[PDB]
A paper describes a structure:
Immunoglobulin M (IgM) is the most ancient of the five isotypes of immunoglobulin (Ig) molecules and serves as the first line of defence against pathogens. Natural immunoglobulin M (IgM) assembles into monomers (composed of two heavy and two light chains), pentamers and hexamers.
We have also studied the IgM-Fc monomer (defined as Cμ4-Cμ3-Cμ2 dimer) by both smFRET and cryo-EM for comparison to Fc in the pentamer. Mutation of the histidine at the centre of the Cμ4 dimer interface (H518E) disrupting dimerization produced a single low FRET state (‘open’ conformation), whereas stabilisation of the C-terminus by a coiled-coil domain produced a single FRET state corresponding to the high FRET state of the wild-type construct (‘closed’ conformation). The differences in the Cμ3 domains are in line with a stabilising effect of the interdomain disulfide bond at C414 in the IgM pentamer. The symmetrical structure of the IgM-Fc monomer also supports the idea that the asymmetry observed at subunit 1 in the IgM pentamer is attributed to the interaction with the J-chain. We have also shown that the Cμ4 domains in the IgM monomer are inherently dynamic, but are stabilised by a coiled-coil which may mimic the transmembrane segments.
Numbering used by the authors:
A (entry chain B), B (entry chain A): 345 to 556
């Protein structure tokens, strides 16, 4: 009997320029006649959700609810909760969601790594690594750009923010992109751009080519 | 009401040259008078476990049991199960554990990446990446060697085997080690050695220095 909510990730916030709240139901049998409403700390309600979900095929029911809010209150840390009503439960369950500020806010550093000389001898593939170290909190966004045009999210893999051993609280993350030699040796540059909330303009780009 | 077992990882098997089986209890209240025994597919028993565990402080009970076996039967895929007896359960629960063979067995490739030129300008740290791509199944072991002497496992971080987008079934993993510039520019070589069960001798070493 759980209902887990999804706080907005800085990745989505920077990608869409619009803060949403999301919560889903779990550990409950599929049913109907369920209403989802978001209530803030004071008590008043917000815009109505849309896009009613379905039931998972694993004897679990899930409902999704959307609410558009300003980013200032979320950054401040207002207490937010969505309301879920069901049949078996006697009292509707409340799910507290909030983001604090005491988390340190250090700007990260960006490093790009060209492929090894010895990998470009099989003439089959190449790998470029964009390396980000030393940021707090644990929300980062990385994407790859080719000739000013975004690449599909199916050609690169991004690691989750995992802590440095040599620090009390700090993190790092990795991303590698798979291209073809003829492209790397004779193609274009795949800039990696990272967006962190501790950055001045929240945007940082680095460029890597064959002759760097 | 679950009891999850730990199949031997190729990492542990290669590290200790001795195959063990392990199973732990969960989702049960702490109690006593519990016996753990391993039974193979035929029905006969094996050596007695040791090192009785304790109870987790989260209202969960756990028992650990050890059994030493040959590697040939485990590689073949014999059906193995440890027996757990408790008070509330009417019938002892059996936990089936076995490793198959239909998993592909491609040898991996090893790549070492020196630190970026631009990171060695802050004169504060350096990072070396050992990159392993294209192996099956999902069991790998990586460790770092300095002047023939193993380094402590608290100075490097190893990724989990996660699949390549450009392949039906294949994986890769990463590892980065943190050293000091004066060490990297004027120190020794930190060889990364990887052990995979598809390799001929199960051992592969690569060497990287300042002048490579």
């Amino acid at each position: 009997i759980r209902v887990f909510a999804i706080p907005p990730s800085f990745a989505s916030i920077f990608l869409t320029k619009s803060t949403k709240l999301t919560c889903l139901v779990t550990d409950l049998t599929t049913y109907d006649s369920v209403t989802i409403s978001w209530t803030r700390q004071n008590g008043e309600a917000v815009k109505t959700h849309t896009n009613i979900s379905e039931s998972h095929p694993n004897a679990t029911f899930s409902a999704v609810g959307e609410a558009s809010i300003s980013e200032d209150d979320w950054n401040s840390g207002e207490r937010f909760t969505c309301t879920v009503t069901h049949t078996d439960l006697p009292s509707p369950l409340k799910q507290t969601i909030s983001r604090p500020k005491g988390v340190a806010l250090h700007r990260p550093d960006v490093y790009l790594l060209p492929p090894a000389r010895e990998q470009l001898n099989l003439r089959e593939s190449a790998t470029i690594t964009c390396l980000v170290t030393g940021f707090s909190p644990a929300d980062v966004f990385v994407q790859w750009m080719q000739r000013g045009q975004p690449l599909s999210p199916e050609k690169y893999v991004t690691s989750a923010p995992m802590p440095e051993p040599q620090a009390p609280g700090r993190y790092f993350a990795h991303s590698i992109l798979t291209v073809s030699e003829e492209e790397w040796n004779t193609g274009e540059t795949y800039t990696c751009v990272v967006a962190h909330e501790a950055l001045p303009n929240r945007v940082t780009e680095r460029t890597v080519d064959k002759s760097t």
